[model samples]
Target: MHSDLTFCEIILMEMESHDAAWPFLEPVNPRLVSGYRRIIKNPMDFSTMRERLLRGGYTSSEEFAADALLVFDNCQTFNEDDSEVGKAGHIMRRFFESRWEEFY
Candidate 1:
């Protein structure tokens, strides 16, 4: 019995939208929101990663990929002892596991 909002939508609405600088407006930036939507819709799209990093002003795709990989690895190692991080990790694991062959 989860609500209809996807995890990414929740993150954007609850977290990103509250950032002090460039706090996302109620409607949100179309590009940023759409980008996240696209990623959620197609988690296996490497091009989405590339697009995100490039738009974020990173000049090196290699660096961006490396950073993303590191973060993902850390997430994979997360333990459920801490509820929040654990839940996050669980979500990630489920998403990636379900899409493993597609990503690989």
Candidate 2:
């Protein structure tokens, strides 16, 4: 109910619209991504973040930002830097961090 929430929503929408965001739009499929669950214990995705945002689960911008970064971190851990999803994760991470600094 403040600037932080507003910023989160704005960033979420921007991220979802990005072409490189496909892999992060939803949770990584455990079956498709073998051993994903074991590596990424606290899996995160845009859908879950948005759900939590709307459900009033986030108390501060820091919490939301952490989750956002976590998605990329998990992706990097599971994918090779030269791979499609890995490249996207790096791009999205840079985008988010840049915006985070300018806005916050």
Candidate 3:
């Protein structure tokens, strides 16, 4: 019934359903964090770096760092008055889709 859901959307939904996953550690901490500043900073090769660890990427390190930082720049600024509907979910789905499109 929910065919519109994307890969990241599915993952995010599953993680959120589990109350124990406050921060979504299973995927976020591995490579999406600042600690991976080196690899994430470098523009990854489209062919490799498939599953976060099996690394094989290239390009300007500074550019990816800039991109990633910019990606994290905005918080989910949902005011109480505007929290109705599901803009946040839609925004997140678009974000993940865009990310994958850019990378793979």
Candidate 4:
């Protein structure tokens, strides 16, 4: 039989899988790999920004998630070639990882 998983469990699984993928990317360019790592670790930053948008009258969760996804997508694009974006991702990831539980 198949087992059901909660949202948190799915995220945890994704995080773990991401961890496993880290080593394979290491030789490509450690810095670029690190940027990708930072992006995944910082999912909570997206959550907080979503909340702020709601408070600011976004009101719809779908819209907030969509907008936040766009921001993250842009972050990924910028981090590909911009050191500043990579640095920002690291800091943002740290902040989000620390506060992740509070988000849910």
Which runs in model 1 stand beyond 4 Å of their true positions?
Answer: 1-52, 55-66, 76-82
For residues 1-104, write the lDDT of model 3, one tens digit per residue: 12222333343344345343322222233254454444333332211122332231313333333333333332222212234313443444355446545644
Backbone clash count, each prediction separately:
0, 0, 1, 0
- Segments in model 4 whose C-alpha atoms lie over 4 Å from true places: 1-56, 97-100
Clashing pairs in 3: 45-57
Global lDDT of model 1: 0.37
Among all candidates shown, the one with the greatest TM-score: 2
RMSD of 1: 14.5
Candidates in order, TM-scores: namely 0.29, 0.96, 0.22, 0.33
Ranked by TM-score, top first: 2, 4, 1, 3
Question: Each prediction's Cα lDDT score?
Answer: 0.37, 0.91, 0.34, 0.41
Using lDDT, rank the candidates from best to worst. Answer: 2, 4, 1, 3
lDDT of candidate 2 over 1-104, digit per residue (tens): 49989999899899989888999999888998778888888999999998999998999989999999999989888999999999999999999999899997
TM-score of 1: 0.29
Cα RMSDs of all predictions?
A: 14.5, 0.9, 15.5, 12.9
Candidate 2's displacement at residue 73, Å, is 0.7
